[PDB]
Design a protein around this ligand. Structure first.
Ligand code: FWO
Ligand code: FWO
Ligand code: FWO
Ligand code: FWO
Ligand code: ZN
Ligand code: ZN
Ligand code: ZN
Ligand code: ZN
Ligand code: ZN
Ligand code: ZN
Ligand code: ZN
Ligand code: ZN
Lengths: 370, 371, 384, 370
């Protein structure tokens, strides 16, 4: 149970230099000099990467039943070093069950991962477990908010201000009674209206800006600019990761320049559709998001000479704040979830979550259906 | 024993009426100058005789829970009610609609009534649409004898459901007509938070609809001078406002009351304990728990600014009895036999009488089912 | 303005059900004192005296089975009976009634029954109601016969459930046990009696269900209250066996216009010393129909609340002592519902009737200490 | 976080003699020779007492609204050394909410205790969170079964075999999908029918006897005899503790004699009514169960010269089995929940749960509303 990781260059979001880290399920003790032992010389110790937006049950289906994407194998997470995922439903609210989403999140947790879910889906009014999104967040311990509610998209339900305000108010007080944060995840399409509705709430109500969490905020110039204003008023935005004009990389730099990286987060959009529509509202082709798009994006920003100290924020501190999680920092009391990158190779070699090795030195623990 | 006489008391029929003997059963039979079947007597030499205090806003089941499940405050004991002189309470639900039962609040009102107290309740809670007993707020007031209105409906608070005007117009309409059918008052209690919109909605109702003002009963309105100034505007149009009673723990409710009395508006002011109700500092932190002690304490503190007792007692006896159309708050023939007895010198509650029975006799409390 | 709150009745021969001779009674809304002659012109404050020389003081009559909203309608929409007038009750010395629904549970609402009980309450009468009707499953205020008895003060049980009747829903034994279980535990929570009133037709099965429940379950017999048990003598003899196991049976009072009657039944229950186990009910504003042998409607009479005092007067004409006959309409109905009525004594609710000593007519009526009728004159009423 | 309890006479259900016990939130290491340290010489170390049947929200009300009992203060648990409680609803299913019961159990946990709940109440059909007792046990992580279903009582709903069989089958499969045990708690009244229905199930169906958990099985001679047969067929019974003819003490001995103590458990019936009814079904007087009735019962059996080794079974091993709990034994990996009794004084002095001291050496931690 009690474990050590000696003579690793410990990279708590800000650099804390060559130190040993003792840990059960949480960081128990830190101290330079000397149950399981693990030597990690040559490796960098980070806190486990956080993914706040992943279609863990699969998604897509904009082009029919054929375009229904596959469910997520934990196999892919561990190679990518993603130790905690927040599962949401997407465009399809009928064939993808909320109970199914509870279960996949419950199974991912039982095979070593850390899981939380939303209770909504694209459409307003939102699908529920118990008839009421407030009731869901008080009674289902894993529910941390609602989404992903579509706004300014062609696949939107066309929601009104008053409808939405109901939801936010219900989910917020839902939070307070239950002692959770109570987030609203906001799928933002390519409509000109953008995130107007989000400004309305904070301007015209008693609603704090912490509860509003818009995603895909990197997909255009225009929209990222709105994402920065929203940031500058004390709110946090989320950017969809880059994965094989203007990219998610340029944006994550453009936030450092204007001094706003403390308000950014990245999403894999794993197992989610990446659809291409023509001149009308017809469907042309698709791609499928990969949960290894996080670590891939991190390295392509370091490639531009940003400090690894202030890039790990987007995936470790910045997300853990948004959801009020006891994770995302290597320090006494915090939950014990780390990844280990080799020197200047820049490749994950080991992965720890809740103090159990899921990947040790490039050999994966074996899982039930692989 | 069940026909009683209080002798040699200086009586405050709210208004002062000098030294008088009161004869009562469950209601007052006679008030006259010294005179004399088995009947009990109580010599009240040295004592003042006042009406029973009325508390229009108490979370008798418990409330709060806004800081998580750890914030769940405990339920009201009647013990407090007897030592603090409160013979009548009106129970309501708060921010938690899901885990605090309406049906639980009906049962809590029934146990307290049954150990010598007087109880009424509101249906619903903070959230719009409001939780009901029977699917309909108009049905509830008609069918369940203790429901006297709806609340506390949250306007201009961060924990508000963000209600529209249209929603609130149906709600007050429904409970008003429901009030008429049942022969009760049909009050909407409004929880007013610290939002800039204040009570704009209440003004919107009287300015653009047929709905009388007597149904709109805003509470918490000594939280800022700005709100109170908008409260007084309301008072001048026939409305009644509730002030949260100062507790044993700028601009205060004591300030607030004297400002009202000096404008000749103390007839339009009441005070609530908000007992067992959460009192949290919410910043952009901490919590404390209201006591029913808060009203008699607040009465003294305003007496200490030199206001005449008979005129002050109106905020807790005459003015609540009016708003809920109750047969209480006045010592007279036909009125309900609810009295407190305070030492004239000490000014500390020594005996409390509810429905003509002694709940406390010279400091010695009646003993109850779980003490 | 209000009427003098302390009253005294002097020089009456008091039938506190049990005879207690010439006594004065001081009262407000409850009975304050029973005692020998005492100086009643010594009080310094208001007090209305009433001289009752030559009259008999008795408790207020309780009528446990009344269609206060109207009922009937077995012969089409033309056979719906009118609703009860409080002047009927005042003339008949009936100070308390318990109202129920019957055959029609489609066009007679429970909310309408709740209102009429409250309007009766407010003119000087004491009122209670049942939830449900004839049919199984039973109609409800709130969706459940348990919520109704817990949330609605005036609700004291469910009925009248139709068993051994052509108009019955043909209820199952499992259906009925669920219903009696629900209303009892409901009574326990709300501190009421939790009664199931049974409307018993003329089926061969009689009350087999009532005997099935007591013999095969822990449900005590206090909660099973069957009515119309003088219908046929076969049914009345099934009633007596029910009595000897601690039960209470209700008989429909003899009607002032028309062989084995409820008089025969009452006298047989005295003979066998089981008079503590019977009640009588007017079935006022109820259908009293005739069906031919094919099951079709022929015609009907309408029950009357005058039936109670009328029935008691017949029984007296057969030499039974007054002090023991009054049980059926005072002590016995007060038991079944756990009411603070039916006896003249310190503490008890001040519901009286006064009868002339030879005439044996009701001349004055007092409920809540208030005179509804004083010396044959009624008080002014709301819609009369 | 890491704690030791040195030179205590460690009384793992069976005696393991003077040993040190290291423990975070679970028993981490056991070893004789030598972060917080606690010396416990003179004291006996036991595993934390288990209460499988407590009306944590209050109950009673058979005699009106006046007879409604008060809610349970954690203050009383800690003095009594009761570290884990299973909350149920009783006779009243209307005024006592299931949401209220979730919350009180949630609050007791947040102030140091360990809590689980049922989803039913006396009446059949049973009240639910989500419309369906199966759905409740899959979706509400704290739900471990259904009860307390009344059988052979005057306050019974009069349930049929077929109705009940539905429930048991639904709760069982509910268990399997969710990876919980899925118990049916059975309030048994003083009816002659007794637990007949329980024999029917195992005789006439494919239903395993582990799911059937009858309570109050000590209240009569006749019924305890039925409790022993049920035991002898591989099932477990529950006895209502003794607290100030034939008692719960005689019975717990009578199980040792016939060699059946491995199939017994004790309940406080805390905050529950103990009602007295006369000749008919009317109510006379009441008493209110106390959660300190457990430890009080334990000592009055030791008074009869039974080994403390084989008496702690009823409150530690026997209950933890029934509910499939990682508790009730002092040994590596088990959750860290202990009580400390002084020499031959026989009085709790300290109480530990999840490795946090709730009572240290007779001074209680201070709690929010005391
Ligand atoms: C990458 C961009 C262009 C596509 C993206 N749409 C979705 O991701 C669809 C949704 N996740 C699903 O599962 O169906 C967008 O926000 O614009
Ligand atoms: C004047 C202040 C103290 C009013 C207000 N209090 C609450 O909202 C308490 C809530 N109604 C409950 O009891 O559940 C506040 O502090 O914001
Ligand atoms: C005694 C006989 C003739 C009348 C009785 N019918 C009813 O009581 C009708 C029902 N209660 C109603 O009015 O809706 C019966 O047939 O047994
Ligand atoms: C001790 C025995 C005699 C009484 C016991 N009844 C209950 O405990 C009632 C239930 N817990 C409640 O909360 O209402 C029994 O099983 O026989
Ligand atoms: Zn999206
Ligand atoms: Zn998406
Ligand atoms: Zn408030
Ligand atoms: Zn309040
Ligand atoms: Zn009938
Ligand atoms: Zn009838
Ligand atoms: Zn029980
Ligand atoms: Zn119990």
């Amino acid at each position: 149970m009690i474990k050590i990781i000696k003579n690793a260059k410990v990279f708590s979001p800000e650099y804390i230099g060559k130190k040993d880290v003792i840990f059960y399920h949480k960081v128990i003790h830190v101290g330079e000099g000397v149950h399981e032992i693990y030597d990690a010389n040559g490796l960098l110790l980070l806190p486990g990467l956080i993914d706040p937006h992943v279609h863990i049950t699969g998604g897509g289906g904009e082009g029919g039943f054929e375009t229904r994407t596959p469910e997520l194998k934990i196999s892919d997470c561990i190679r990518s070093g993603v130790t905690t995922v927040v599962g949401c439903l997407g465009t399809d609210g009928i064939t993808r069950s909320l109970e199914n989403l509870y279960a996949k999140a419950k199974s991912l947790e039982s095979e070593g991962l850390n899981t939380f879910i939303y209770t909504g889906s694209y459409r307003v009014p939102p699908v529920t477990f118990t008839g009421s999104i407030m009731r869901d967040i008080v009674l289902i311990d894993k529910v941390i908010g609602v989404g992903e509610i579509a706004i300014s998209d062609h696949r939107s339900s066309q929601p009104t201000l008053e409808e939405i305000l109901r939801i936010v108010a219900d989910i917020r007080v839902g939070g307070m009674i239950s002692g959770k944060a109570g987030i609203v995840n906001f799928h933002v399409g390519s409509g000109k209206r953008g995130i107007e509705y989000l400004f309305d709430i904070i301007e015209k109500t008693e609603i704090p800006i912490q509860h509003l969490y818009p995603t895909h905020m990197s997909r255009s110039r225009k929209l990222f600019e709105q994402g920065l204003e929203f940031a500058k008023r004390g709110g946090t935005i989320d950017l969809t990761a880059l994965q094989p004009e203007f990219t998610t990389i340029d944006a994550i730099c453009e936030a450092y320049e204007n001094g706003l990286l403390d308000n950014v987060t990245i999403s894999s959009d794993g197992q989610g559709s990446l659809p291409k529509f023509d001149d009308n509202g017809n469907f042309v082709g698709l791609d499928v998001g990969s949960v290894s798009a996080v670590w891939y994006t991190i390295r392509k920003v370091l490639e531009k000479g940003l400090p690894l100290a202030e890039v790990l924020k987007i995936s470790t501190t910045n997300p853990a704040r948004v959801f009020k999680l006891n994770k995302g920092k290597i320090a006494k009391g915090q939950d014990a979830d780390f990844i280990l990158v080799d020197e200047q190779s820049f490749e994950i070699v080991s992965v720890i979550s809740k103090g159990e090795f899921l990947m040790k030195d490039g050999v994966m623990k074996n899982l039930n259906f692989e």
